[model samples]
Every structure is written in C-alpha cells, then in structure tokens.
Target: KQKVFFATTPIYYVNASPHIGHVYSTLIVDVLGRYHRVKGEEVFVMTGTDEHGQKVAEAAAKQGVSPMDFTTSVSSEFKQCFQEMNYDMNYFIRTTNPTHEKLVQDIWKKLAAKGDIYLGKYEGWYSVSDESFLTAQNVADGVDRDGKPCKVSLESGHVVTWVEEENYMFRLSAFRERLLKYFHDHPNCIVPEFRRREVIKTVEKGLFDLSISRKRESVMNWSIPVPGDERHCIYVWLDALFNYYTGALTRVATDGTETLDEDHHALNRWPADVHVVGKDILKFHAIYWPAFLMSAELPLPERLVSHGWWTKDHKKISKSLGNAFDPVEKAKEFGIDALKYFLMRESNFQDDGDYSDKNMVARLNGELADTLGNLVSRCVAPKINVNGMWPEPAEYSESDKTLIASLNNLAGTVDHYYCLPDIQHALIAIFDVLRSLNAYVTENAPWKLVKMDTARLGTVLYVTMEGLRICTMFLQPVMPQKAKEIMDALGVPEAARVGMENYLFGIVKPGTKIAGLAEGQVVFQKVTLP
Candidate 1:
C-alpha cells in the first residue's frame, strides 16, 4: 500500500481562550504535516476543540451563557489563533458539530452492540476539571485555591470529588492483555520509550473497566445522549477522542463542499500516522483511545507522540496562579515566525521546557539574528552579488566538496528526526548545518576573496548562498513565511521548492537572478520586549 501522513492535535478543551499550550500542540501537528508535505507525501492535518464537557457546561453557567454559545466563542478563538499562527490545517472538528455527534453515537452503538459496553454504576473520585474518574491510587492530598486541603489527581493537580451514580461502562479491563501484546509487538507505539514503559507498568499491575458515561441529569441538557438509551450522556473523553477519527473520515468545508467525495485526497486517514498529545493525557491516547478502537475493530494509530508541558516562572502556566503565557502577545511583540521558531528551538518532545521572555531575546538575536539573518545579509550584499545573481561557482575546491557532502546528508538526517516528530532536534540538525556553512564563510572570507580573486569570490558566495537556500528550506516547517522570503531572495524558483532536491546542494542553476532582496535589508530584526 502507498504511504500517506495524517497528523492530529488533541482537539483542545475550550474552557478558556487559546493559550501557549494549545499553540504548542497544534504547532507540532502543523510542523510535522509540513514536513511530510515537503517530503512529497499526501498530508492531512486535523485540529479543533474538545468543547462538550462538564467543565464547559459549568463555565457557561458561571458566564451566564448557553453551553453552545460559550463553546462557539472559544472554538472561534482557537480557529482564529491558528489562522494567526498560519497553521495549514485541513479540517477543524468541533465536538459540537452534528456530523461529529452522529459519528460518536454510531461508535457508541457499535461498542454497545459488541458487548464492550454494559449498564453499570460509577462511584469514584471524579475530577470535573480533568473530566475523568480516578481510582484510589491516582488520587493524592493537595491544597485548594484558598490554601485548604483537598484530594487531587496524581496525574493532574485538579481537585477530585466523590461521585456515585448509575451509568454505563466500557469493558476496558478485557483488552488489557491484548494492549500489552500490542505494545510489546509495536514497541514504538507510544514514543519517548519511557512513557511507553509507564503505560506497560500500569496495565501490568491491573486493569479496570472504565466508566464511559454519566446520567444526563448530572450534566444537565449539555451532553450527547447514548444511542438507544437517552438517559445517560456519553463520556466527554470518549466524545473528544472521536474527533480525530471522525474528522479523518469526513470533512465539510466552510465553502459547503464535503471533501470525502470520489476524488478526495484525505481518504485512508483513519488510524492516524501520529497523534500528538501532552504527557498529562498520555494514558488516554496510549491506552483508552486504542482500547476503544480495538473494541470497534478499527485500525490503531501508527504512533502516539507525547510532549511535556511548558512552564513559566518555573511553575506550570495556569490562569489561577496568574501566569498563563499569552502566545498572542509574544507573537505581537516578536513576529509570528520568530515566536514559532523560538519555541521549536527551545523545547524538546520528551522533556518539559520553561518559557522565558529573557531567553526569547537571546535566542532570537543570537541564533536567528546573528547566525541565520547575518548569513543571509552577507550573501545578499550587493558587493559580492552583482545584479542579485546567484553567482556561478568555478571548479570546486576540496573544502567546497566537503561542505556539499555535509549539505547532502541534510534531507535524510532531518527526515530521521521528523519521523520521530522530534521538532527541537530537527531544528538543531538544520541549524548545525547552517553554522558549519557560517564557519566555511569565516574561514575563507568571501568579502576578502572578492577583492583578491573575483572567481574564487563567486565560488565562495555561491556556495554560501546555496547552503543558505538549502538550510532555509529545511527550516520552512517552523518558519514558513521567513524561509520563503529567504528562499525567494536566494533566487529559488517555486517549482524547485517541493522535494528532496530542494534540501541538498548544487540544485539552483547558475546566473539565476534573485527576486526579493533589498539593499541592506534586515532579514530578521533583533529586538527586546518590555
């Protein structure tokens, strides 16, 4: 079978406006999607909000608005935020959509008919904020907002309360051994192998039938009723996770065109290539979602990639403690691509990374400005580049051949990290090549070569510019607009911007006139935020 790439962000919980955390998750999808697209794969990206839940209902209550209205507004903010960030999303699935609701019910009925679900009672510590029931071991002592004692979720710090009610349950326990087998066979199923080990340990200890629904009276009218039994509303996690599957199957565009027609490109997107999620929710994706799919006899996803949280002031960014990092403000202070580049450069997929505006200043100026932008500025300088022509190199020197050999490895090396969906290390790979090119320029100064030997100067400048073009091409996933500008300035044609050839050396033809360089143009401006 032919290979295709489908990447998804955890449909965000829209209790609040879009924040940095949401931005990070969706950016991972967009970045990976772009990588596959640029690698000449048919790529589809799905992202949206998990808007139907008890917390959303209560949030609407506190705001004196209907749940539908509240979700609509918050969902709009997320959609708008993605637009501002320039995400290349194919579909945004809202849990509130009628099509999505139908799919959820259909899946629920299938699970019910298959005997995976049965009528039962649920009694445990339910965290409305986390929107899941916890067993005894997962709960711990914690403090409330008022500095009082409370029982908190061991996984998430939210307070949990005792809840006992008649409900429906999924036979999650029955699939434990099967899940263990799946994990054992597909060792990389849940990445950051440490996380996979944890999930295995969890299932090895024991398994419990997950409570999959609640009485409708508990959540009021704001719920999706179980098919054939309207008394119980479906679990929010169940509803939320289906967004990825449902979104893959069918997508109705804003232009009133349903894309899954006879010639749709996003077909076979089920069993997603990658599901990008936070470490906090690894259990749901690594365990629960796969369990649900097994019950339905559907294909499991290729990989589940988890990233740790972004903290500010060495504390988890939270609205309650008044330290939520506003991505919009940072994007405004810096340019969109600058903020985007800084984040991928700063954070890794396997570990938590702290966000600091001070560090942002250093990163932007030091790396983006001094290394990348300065290289671009030097190559595009009118003294070396007459008529903005991509200078033709003469017979190559040993050093030039060595640099090209190094440049040659970029595509495969970068594709390696992108396969792991390791955004930080991928950027490091690209920038490391760029820095080598910078050193190449410093060792055989192109500016000096021009005065002493003009032919050598052309060779030097052409290699530098070619290196710049290729490195910037690899960077396109994170900094789309800026990379395009640099590529354009380097005389790379639109036709030459698509495949493996674009990221290697010696592709750009000699004597090609560059399109968009201005005299002394600052490709990236170094600045400080107040």
Candidate 2:
C-alpha cells in the first residue's frame, strides 16, 4: 500500500474574505500535496473556513444577516479563491456543517466521560477578535484604532474585555507534565527549532485549564452547542480544530458532502502527518489541540509546522490598512506560477518577509527568463540542429562529465529539501543548477561550434537540454503549469513525468524525434510594472 500523507491548512475564520496570508498557508500545503501525488503517494489536502465565533457573529449583525447566512457567503468566497488558484484540495470543511458539529459534540462527551471537562465559570480578559481568553499578563490597557480606552491582547493587539461567565472548562493544566514529556520524547514534533523552543517554554511557563465553552446568551448563539447543555455553546477553537478529524470522516469525493457508511473509517487518518499553521496560533495547535486529543485517547498529529507572517512596508497587512491585495488578481497580473515561485523562493519558511513587487520582478527576469528560459531557447532553436532529436554525448570531456553527473544527482538533492517542506532550499537547488548550466553553455559555446563541428555541437546541446529537463521535472510541483509547458515543448511523455520516483540517467534516448524549437515556445515571460 502507498504511504498516506494527510496535510491541512488551519481553517481560516470566516469573519473576512481570504487574504494573502491565507493564500500563503494554503499554497504551501498544496505544493506538498501535489509533490507527493506526483511521486505516486496517496495525499489528502484539507482547508476551509471556521464559521463560528464572536467575531463572525458581530460582523454578521453589522451586515444585518443571520450568522449562518453570512458565513455561507464568506465561506463560498474562500472556496472560490482557492479554486481560482487551481488548488486541487481533497476536502474543504466548514465548522457550521451538521456533521462537524455532531463530531465535535461527540468528542466533547468523550473528554467529559474521562473527567477531563467540568462545569465552571470563565473569568478573564476575552479578546473577541482572537476568540481567546487571556490572562492579565497577556493584556494591557491601550487605545483602540479610534483612540478609545480598551484592554488589548498584547499578543495580537486585539481589544479585549474582562468577562465573567458560566461555561465548561478543559483540564489543560493536568496535562502539562505529559505534554512536556511528549515534546521531549518527540523533539521534532514542532518544526523550525526556534518555534519548537517557543512551544516548550510556553508549556514550561505553565498551562491553565482552558475555557472550552461559551454561554450562547453571551455570544449570540453562533456556535455548536455543548452536549446536554443547550445554554452554552462550544468554544470556537474546540469546535474549529475538530474539523480536521470530522472532515476526514465526513468528506466524500462529491462536493465535500458526507456519504454515510462510505469510508466511515476515514477517522483513522488521525495522527495527521502534519498540521500547517501560522506562528500566531502555535499555542493552540501545539498545546490545546494535542491535550484535547490525549483526553479522548487519540494520538496526536506527527508534526506541527508553523510558518511566519507577511507584512507590507513593515506594517501588518490588514483590511484597515487598505493594503491587502487580491492574490487572484496578482496571479493574473504576473503569472500563477510566477507568484508561486516568488512566494517560496523569496522567503525562508520560518521567518517573516516583507512583500516586494520590485524583488519579484527582478527574480523573474534574472532567474526565470535570463537563465532557464534563454537556455531552453538556445538549445532548441531550429537552425542549430539539422535533426530534431534528443542527441547523445559522443565522449565524456571533464566539463561534460561534471554536467551529466549533476543532472543525474539533481532529483535526489531537490527531494531532500522538499521533504522538510523547505521550499526556499528546494528552489535554491534548481537555481544553482541553472547557474551552472549557464556557465557551461558560455564556456562550451555550442552556438559558435555549430558550423565547425556539428557532432560536437549536438553533444553540447544534448547535455544542456537534458540538464534543463531534469531540473524542470523536479520543479513541477512548485510551478506546475510552466513546468508542464516546458516538458510539452521538449516532447516528454506523460508516463515519464513521475519525477524522482525512478532516477534514471540518459533515459531521453538519442535519435528520438522531438518538436523542439519548431514552434518557438517560451515557458516564462518577463514581468514589468509601470
């Protein structure tokens, strides 16, 4: 049986439209899923909206629509945005779905039966925007955007207020020692050594039992109700995170709807391969989520991959700033693959990055156009070759042998970086090879030798073409359309597209007819903005 890889982006809250941050998270997961799929592995890509929360409820009230109706509209917009980017997601879950609500309630009962939950009064500072309760240390008196007195969460700068309400609580404090032991035993459970350290320190500083439910009368009845307690609604985080499990159990191949008794065992997809989330929510996933799973006698996810944020002009990109750009529009303006490449290539996965259109344009022109594109054009231009075929090298010169060895080794080198899901490193490997090939072409001067030594020229051109083909194959998961186009122009067969699965050298075969340069194909176009 093929290995199963389950990956998910945090289900974004439906209080607002999808932003570039949301796009960034989903793209990472999509690339991973696509890469595994191309390598003949079974992969599940899940993403969707978190529809229940005080934030969503208030936003709906301002718009004069029922919370459910408002969430329906916003959630569809998110689905449309992901679809527009050509993400082949297997499941798009919504917290408001009947199946999700039911599953969350069931899980609640399991924890309660284990004495991990209890009736209690929640007394703390609550951040409506974050939908989280904060201790005094996490909040401070501050001025809001309107300059009014407000208690704001130090972590998110969202306004909070002192709240006293009767609800249910989870015994997160009881699991602190267990969580510490689990983290120590599985040091790699959280990614990016720094992020893991942060999680460990937070757990060490101490954990407080979490408020797991909210009085429905307090939050406008916009959540899943606690079982046997209709007056209180399940807290948003508890309701939201369970979608990962419920989604796997409920989703059918058709419109992500449920098909009862059809793969009822889908819940076994638990102990998820990875949970891809932003750094801001690391505490929830790393601390509360695993604790919840332990309470119900379920295994924790294998890994929690936390990524950093994106800012514009060193300021957080938000609706209030009027700076949030529509990712779909940007994709159309530049190219889908161009945007995808810049996202992965321009930033380290664990560090925050400033968005720079100028940098994007330069990278595209320098790397994509000047190096890879020109190399492909030069190798396939019609007049240089009398016979259109994948030519073979005559004999191994020092330069020729070095180039061949690198091409043969390219797939394994790139795959190593990809397994860490470190896209920046993976892209660097491709570009390094591109730079090497460019130097090789300049020294060999295949253009100058075409007249004096046709056979020698064929050998040089074949090496360059095959080298480019190998690098392009490994890059397919990151730049799907453009890579496929390059492969098509080279006349690569569909059967041979399984990248790195079976590393074979000199497999293109000499003397095989190809349509190279006959049509004058260009895979990547330069981007210019006025």
Candidate 3:
C-alpha cells in the first residue's frame, strides 16, 4: 500500500524577514517531504507565517504600517524564499486567516468546557520576543541594547518584563503526570533522543498553568479575541500552535462556508507524522502541544524532530552585524541544489552548523564538482565515445563483477541511513560508491584500453556509467533538478524514473544507450569564492 506522510515546520513568526535559521528549518521539512514523495507516498507539507503577537504589532508600528500590511510583506518574502530554494510545501497558512482564528477559538471553547481553562490574574516576567512567561528562576539581570539594566530571559536572552493581567489559563500543571506517561508510552515520539530527554527532564521537574490569553487592551490589540470575552485575546503561542491543525482542518463547503470544527479534520490528516521544529521550541511542541491536544482529546503528533541553529563566522547571525545569510541570494550566487546538498551534508541535522561563504564554496567545489560531478563528466567526455552511448560490457573480469555487486548492494545500505532520516549518512553512502568508482576507473585505465582493447573499454565505461546512474537516481531526493539533468543526459527513460524502490530492488540495464549527450550539459559547474 502507498503510505500517507504528513510533515510540518513550526509556523514562522513574521516580526522580521526570514533568516538562514528559518531557511534551515524549512529545508529539513522540504527534504523529508521530497524523500517521501519519491518513495511513492502521499505527502502533505505545511508551513507558513505566525503574524499575531506584541512583537509583530510593535514591528509594524515602527514601520508605520498596519499589522496585516507588515505580515503580508514579510510572509510573502518567506514564500518567495521557499520558492527560490525549491521547497515543495503544500499549504502556506497564516495565523491571521479567518479559518485559523475560528478553529483556535473552537479549541479554546473545548478546553474551557473541560475546566482546563480558567480565568486568573497572570503575574510574571513575560518575554515579548518569545511570547512566553519566564519564572523568576529563569530570568536574570542583563544589559539591553541601549545599555540599561534589563531583566532578560536566561533561556532566550531576550528582555522580559513583569506584567500583570486578567487572562484565561490552561491548567497545564494538571497534565504533568499524564505528559510524563506519554513520554513513557511513546519513546520514539521525539527525534534526536537527546532533545527528547531534555524535554522530559523539564516536565519531570514540574509544570505550571499556562496563561493562554492576553488582556486585549495590551500589546496593540493584534490577536484573536477570546470566544466569549472580547477583553482578552488568545495568547500568541496557543494561537500559533493551532496553525498545524488549522491548515489540516481548513476546507470550503458547497455552501461556501469554511469548516471551523477540527473533529472531522483529524480524520483526514491530524496526528501529524512528524512536527519539525528547532531545538529552542522543544518544550512547547513536546510538552504543551501534546497537553493541549490531550485536553481537547485529540491525538498527539507521531514525532517531534528538532534541529539546532546555524551561525556565521562563529557568531550568531544577526542583521545588525550584516552577517545573516540570505538563502535566495546564496542560491543565486552558487546553486540551489548545491545549497541544499551542503545544508544536509555539511553537518548532522540535529547539531548546529556554522555557515560561511568559504565553507559553502569549499563544499560545492570539493563534493559536487570534484567527486560526483567529475564522475558524470568523465563518463560522458567526447574522447571516450564521441557519442555518449550506454555501452554493454562484452566481458566481466573479477573486478567488474565486484563493481556490479557493490552497485547492487548500494540501495540497502542507503535505505538503512534514510530510516534515521540521516541525510548525511545517505550522502556518505553514495560518495563511498563515487570513491570506489573513481578508483575503479583508475585501476581499469579505460582511457588506455580504448585504443588497445575496444571490448574492455566498453566494459569499463559501462560499469562506470551504470554506477553514475545509480548515484544520480539516489540523489534525486536531495537535488531534484540536477539529478534529473544527469538522468536525462544518461538517457534514462520515463519508465526508468522509478524512485527509491527501484534503486533498492532493481538494477539498470547495461545496454540502454543514451540517445544524445548534448554539448555543454555539464552536471555541475565549479563555484568560486567571493
């Protein structure tokens, strides 16, 4: 049976233009979505903007535009970024959508009816930037940008303020044991086992009731109002979290009304297969999101995969520093697939990666141009065949037999790494074959054999071309455009465009000749440093 896969990135906050960190997170989701699509699964990828909160309102005021105007411009930039980066996201939702607001209120009503939400006076240090309440233990004295004394959240290092307001609270404290039980029951629910342990430790310490709404009069009145009381607006985090469900739930009826109820929506795509987030928000997704769903009696997502940050020049990438890497600009400078490949191959997905023009250019030249690119270029060079026809081997030596056996075994090895969703390991597997292929060419000396032994020359080129085909096919998920170019140049037919299953189970025929290897169709052009 074809599998159903649902994946999501945490909706991005639109207080500012999207940075490389945002691009990194979105790319993770994009890669996974593409992988599943290639595996013949039905895939739905959800991503978009979070436009409600004090930070957004403040940002808009500074720009002298309305909240809606600011969010629209920034959100559009995010969509454009994704487009330029070649992300195949299905739903681009915004929290300010009418359908999203309605669904969020419906959830609020359900929680309130269950006694999980209560009216209380919230008195604590709130981080406007993080949209979170930090306890006294979590706050410390710090200097603000203007060099004044400020209480900052130790976790996010953003300024915090003591605020008191009458708001609705979710009895998050009451779900403590049940949340722990969930961790016990579903051990694999969170990825990067270390991140799961971190969240569990935080839950094991204790929990507190979460303030789920803000006084409407405060924070520029830019959020969804409480269902019954207009005096309060739903807290930004709570509102934002519902974007996943809202995106899944939103559909139009024949009567022209959008469905606000999510009960039915859950049947279609709820209980997402994985919730892709950054390590910073592990608490909210692993702890609060699950508790919120449990209170609403909805199924928790199957997994929460959290990745770390990306820095530039060994420092946090900042706009003021003029060091934030623009993914679109970088792709334009280098290549989209090169950027995608470097992101996955340069470091472990769960670990922090340092981004620099130097590192990126180096990876492009060394890996793409030198290793994989060289292999493709060598197989199709004019001196080898004049016309790049797929040569069938006339005879098989022990080395040729070893090469074929290794290529046949490649799919199983790569499959094992992909199940970890470890793109690095998958790349490693392919490069290993590239290394062996390069060595195979050197040992066989196909160039020398071309003049002396025509039959041996055909056999050597055939083995190398077949190996290149397998590597190119395996690479389709990460580098779709480039991989397709390589496949087409090899004259891989439409019927032969089968995905992961084909690579893992079947081998390409040797005698299938490429019709025409066009001139200047180099698979990878080497990049230069700025």
State which candidate has the highest TM-score.
1
Compared with the true structure, what per-residue lDDT tens digits does model 2 show for residues 9-103?
A: 99998877787888888988898888887777788879999999788898889889999889999999899999988887888888887888888
Q: Put down candidate 1 lDDT per residue, 95-212, tens digits, no spaces.
A: 9887788888988988987999988888889988878789999899999888999999887788999999988999999999999999999988888899999999999998899988
lDDT of 3 by residue, 1-530 (tens): 43357789989888777777777778878877777777667888879999998978988898999989999998999988888887888878889888898889989998988889888988999988778789889999998889999898887778898998888889999999999999889988888888888888999999989999998778689999999898899999999998988866666568856665546454366778878888778888998899999999987888888877787656655433456767688787888899888888887856776786788788888888888877777787777754468776787899888888889898888766665667788898888898889889888877778778888888888888878878777788789888888888777776566565467323456567675445776677887765
- A best-first ranking of the candidates according to their lDDT comes to 1, 2, 3
Better of 1 and 3 by TM-score: 1
Reference-based lDDT, each prediction: 0.84, 0.82, 0.81
Q: Name model 3 segments beyond 4 Å from true.
A: 1-3, 251-267, 318-323, 504-506, 515-521
Would you give me the overall lDDT of model 2?
0.82
Top model number, lDDT = 1
**Judged by TM-score relative to the true structure, which candidate is superior, 1 or 2?**
1
Give model 2's TM-score versus the native structure: 0.95
- Return the TM-score for each candidate structure: 0.96, 0.95, 0.93
Instruction: Extract clashing residue pairs from model 1.
Output: none
